[PDB]
C-alpha cells in the first residue's frame, strides 16, 4: 500500500507546480512533477512554470509594457520633451531578446528549486494515466512511443492546462497563435488579429505598438462587440480608444480562405467577401482544455464538454484519488485561481482540514492599450439574477491628458449594486492603473462591501481611484426586468 | 433677524468652496464666498478654487507627471525604443505654459459656476470679522485699507487655509516656496530644496526631472531621515531611490546665511559650515494656518498653537454660529478631508441631521519620484498604542525593471496588524501605482478589515497590487513594548 510517490502532478503549471511545492515543503510528501520542457522553447511551447510564465501572462505583460512606451514617448511632448519624432518606430529584436532572457531566468529559477527541495522531483515527458495509481511518462505525446518512467503513486493531480483553439477552415495551417507570436522573427507590418478574446485585444495592442514604420493592425471579431462577458459600456469605450490608437476594429467578419503569396505574406478571404494581405493572421479564438492525450478513459476519469475534466468544488474527479485544477477543469481559466485551486487541494488532501476555492467575485484585468479592471457582476447578469439593481457610472478624462493631447483616454468607472441592500455586486473600470486599483476593490467585494462604504471612505485628491468614493446618485436602475427609474 | 446672506465663506478653498455650493444647491441658502483672486496669478498666489487647484495638488501633479517622463524615456531603451539619447533635457517653458493653461481653465470653470448657480455669490477681497454676524471685505490684507463690501450673515465659515512657513535667518528673503516655484522663469540648474516634508520631496523630484543639462538637485533636511510620520522602512527605501535618481540627499544639515552673487545666483552657508551656490533655495518647511489677518479676537473666536482655529468634531468654533475647516483648523491638512469637513458642516447646520468627519484611517499619498501610498498606523505608533502587534512586509522588484534597467525601483508593502484580532491597522506602500492602490485599500480599512480578508481574496497575476493578498507570515512583532518574536 506504499507507492513510490505520494502525489504525481501532470504539468508544472502555475496551479500544478504550486500544489507540488506546497505538499513537499509544508507537509513533506514525496512529490513528482511532470512537464514537457526545462526552458521556454518553441517546439512544445509551455514548460516548467506553466503557460503563464512561458507563453502567457508574464511575457505578454512585458510586451504590453513595451508597446505602452509608444504612447508615453508621444505624450511627453506636451510636457516639454523634445526629441526625434520622425520615423521613431521600435526594435522587436531587442524586445523579444530581453523578454526571453527574463523568462529564461525564471525557468532557471525552477531548476534550482527542485534541486534544493526535499523530495520534490521533476520528470520531463508526456504524462498519461495507465490506471488510478500509475502514471506513464512517454517521450512523445504519441501513445505508441518509448516509455521513460512509470510513476507509482497514491494520488494524481491533473494540471495540464489548456491549448489554443483553431478555426476549422482552408488556409488554417498558415496562421499563428499567442504561442508562436512570442517567438516571431520580426515585427509584422501588416497584422491581422482574429477573435475578440482578451488575448486578441492585448496582442493587437502589442503588434500595434511594435509595428514598423508605415504598418497597421486589424482586429477581426466574429460578432458585434469585442470582449463578451465584460461591462458593455467598457467594451464600447475600449473599441473606441483602440480606434484612436490605430487598431482598425472590424466586426461581424471572419476569414474563410487563406493562401500564401510568393513573397511569404498571406492572402485572406473574409465573410463579407473582401480580400487583403497580412504578414500574419493570429488566431485568438480562445483556449480548449488539454486532456486530449492523457487517456482519462483508461483510469475511469470522465470529461464533459470538449475535454474539461469533471470535478467538484474540492477539485476531486470521477475517481476518489485523482484530482484536477486550473485551465483543464474549465472553471475560471486564470492563474491566481489555478494557484488557489491547487493550494486548497493540499489543505484538502494532505492538510487534513479541507477547503474549496471561492469562484465568485474574482477580480481580473485586461492589459489592453488602455487596460480594464473588473470584479463581479455586469448589468446584463445582475439585472437578471436580482430584484432591484442600481447602476452607478462616472466617466472622466484625467487632468494630465489635457497637456499630453491624448484626450481620447477617458477613465471610466461603473459600480453595479443591488438597490435592496446597497451591496456592490460588480465594479468595472477602464483606464490606466485599473488593474492595480481593482485588486484592492476585489478585497472590498470579498468582504461583501456596500456602496455606502465606498463613498463614505475619504479620498486621495489626485488619483483616478478616488472617483470610486464620489459615486452616490445612481445613473439608472433595472427593476426586476428592463431599464427604468425609481417606481413605487 | 434676517441677514442678507445665510452663510459667508472666507476662502473659495477646496473645503470652503464645496460648502458654499452644497448649501446653495441642495438646501437653497443665500451664500457668499470671499477670495483674493479670480485666476491663479502670482502676487497673491491662491485663488478661486483654493491652494489645491491653483498652487498645489493639481499643478504639482502635472509637473510630477512631466518629470516622470525622464525616467520613462530612459527606461524604454530596454524594450527597444532607440532615439536621441545625448543631451535630451526637457523644456520648462512648455511645461509651465501648458500647466497654466490647465489651471487657468479651471478658474474659468468656477467663474461660470457662480454665474449659473442659484444665490451663490463671489466677492473678491480680504475677509475680516467685524463681529459674529458681520464680515468686512477690504481690498488690502492691511486692516487700514478701503472697504469694498460689508456682508451681513447668520453664519460664518472660515476656510482660509494655510501659508508657507519661513525659516527665520539672515538671507531668508532671497529664497522661494512652493508658491513661487510654480511660476519660475526657467528650470534651475543648481537647485536646493530645504526641508523634508512631502512638498520638498515632490518638488525635489520635479526640479530633478526638469533640470537642464549638467545640472543637479540637493535636498536638505534638518533631522536624520526625510518624511517624519511615514513608515520608517518606506522612508529609508525612498531616500535610497532618490539617491539612485540623482537627488543628493543631505541630513542633519540646514542653512543659516544666504547672500546673492553678482550673476543673480545665491550663495549658501550651512550647519556643518560648508558653502555652495544654488540658483534657488526653496523652503518646504511646512505650512502655518492662515488666520493671522482675519481678526478672530474681535468676534470672540479663539486660536490655539500658532493660529489654528479652535474647533470641535462638528467644526464649530469658540462662537456658536461661526465654523472653520481644512488647513486653517490644523486637523489633517489635505483636500479631500477639508472637502468632507465642509460637506459635513452643510449636513450639520443646513441639513438638519448632523455628522462629524472621520479623521482616522485617512489614506493619502506622496507623489515622489517613486510615489508612496499610506493609510493608518505605523509600527512606531501601533506598537505603542496596542497590546500585541504583528508586522508583515514584502519588498520586490517588478518583472519589467529587469528589462528597463532601473533595478533600484523596489516595490515595497508592509501591513501592520493587531495580532490579538488580526485587524489591519495600517498599510504602507512605496512604488509606481501606490496612490491608486491605497485608495481602495483605505476603503477596506474603513470597513475595519483584517489580514485574513486580505490574503483570502483572489489575486490578479501581473500587478504590484496582488502582493497585498500574498502576505501571511508576519516578518516580526512588537509585544507590548519593543521588537520581538512570538512568546507565550
Ligand atoms: C497569452 C496568455 C495570456 C494570459 N494572461 C493571463 C493574465 O494576465 N492573468 C491571468 O491571471 N491569467 C492569464 N493567462 C492564463 C494562465 O496562463 C492559465 O490560466 C494558468 O497558467 C493555468 O495554470 P494550470 O496549472 O491550469 O496550467 P498551466 O499553467 O497552463 O501549465 C500547464 C503545464 O502542463 C504541461 N503539460 C501539458 N501536457 C502535459 C502532459 N501530458 N504531461 C505533463 N505535462 C503536460 C505544459 O507543458 C504546461 O507547462 C494567460 C494565458 C495565455 C495563453
Ligand atoms: C504644494 C502643495 C501640494 C499639495 N498637494 C496635495 C495632494 O496631493 N493631496 C492632497 O490631498 N492635498 C494636497 N495639498 C493640501 C491642499 O492644498 C489643502 O489641504 C486644501 O486646499 C485645504 O483646503 P481649505 O478649504 O482649507 O483652504 P484652501 O483650499 O487652501 O483655500 C484657501 C483660500 O482662501 C483664500 N483666502 C486666504 N485669506 C483670505 C481672506 N482673508 N479672505 C478671503 N479669502 C482668503 C485663499 O486665496 C485661498 O484661495 C497640497 C498643498 C500644497 C501647498
Ligand atoms: C446562440 C448564440 N449564443 C452563443 C452560443 C450567443 C451568446 O451570447 C453572445 O452574444 C455571445 C457570447 C459569446 C461569444 N463568443 C465569445 C467571443 C470569442 O472569443 C469568440 C470569438 C470567435 C469565435 N469563433 O470560433 O468565430 C468563438 C469565440 C459571442 C457572442
Ligand atoms: C523634542 C524633539 N521632537 C520635536 C519637537 C522630535 C519629535 O520626533 C522627531 O523625530 C521629529 C518629528 C518632526 C520633525 N519635523 C518634521 C519634519 C519637517 O518637515 C520639518 C523640517 C524642518 C523644520 N525646521 O523648521 O528646520 C521643521 C519641520 C523632526 C523630527
Author numbering:
A (entry chain A), B (entry chain A): 1 to 488
Give the text the authors published on this PDB structure.
Leishmania uses trypanothione as its main detoxifying molecule, allowing the parasite to neutralize the reactive oxygen species produced by macrophages during the infection. Trypanothione [N1,N8-bis(glutathionyl)spermidine] (TS2), which is synthesized by trypanothione synthetase (TryS) and reduced to T(SH)2 by the trypanothione reductase (TR), is used by the couple tryparedoxin/tryparedoxin peroxidase I (TXN/TXNPx) to neutralize hydrogen peroxide produced by macrophages during infection. All attempts to date to obtain a TR-null mutant in L. donovani have failed and mutants displaying a partial trisomy of TR locus, where two TR alleles are disrupted by gene targeting, show attenuated infectivity and decreased ability to survive within the macrophages. The human homolog, glutathione reductase (hGR), that maintains glutathione in a reduced state, has a significantly different substrate binding site in terms of both volume and charge distribution, suggesting the possibility of identifying molecules able to selectively target TR.
We solved the X-ray structure of L. infantum TR in its oxidized state in complex with compound 3 (LiTR-3) at 3.37 Å resolution. The X-ray structure of the LiTR-compound 3 complex is homo-dimeric and is closely related to the TR-oxidized apo-form. In particular, as shown in Fig 8C, compound 3 is bound to the NADPH cavity entrance with an occupancy of 0.8, where it may form several mild electrostatic interactions with the protein residues lining its binding site. An electronic density peak was found close to Gly197, that has been interpreted as belonging to a sulfate ion (with 0.5 occupancy), which establishes electrostatic interactions with Gly197 and compound 3. Compound 3 is lined by Tyr221, Gly197, Asn254, Arg222 and Arg228 a residue which is electrostatically bound to Arg235 (NH1(Arg235)-NH2(Arg228) distance = 3.5 Å). Indeed, the superimposition between TR in oxidized state and the compound 3-TR complex shows that Arg228 and Arg222 undergo a 30° rotation (clockwise and anticlockwise, respectively) to allow compound binding. In particular, the nitro-phenyl group maps to the position of the adenine ring in the NADPH bound TR, and the two arginine residues (Arg222 and Arg228) that in the reduced enzyme interact with the adenine ribose phosphate moiety adopts a completely different conformation in the compound 3-TR complex. As shown by the structural analysis, residues Tyr221 and Asn254, which are involved in ligand binding to TR, are not conserved in hGR, where they are replaced by Ile217 and Gln250, respectively.
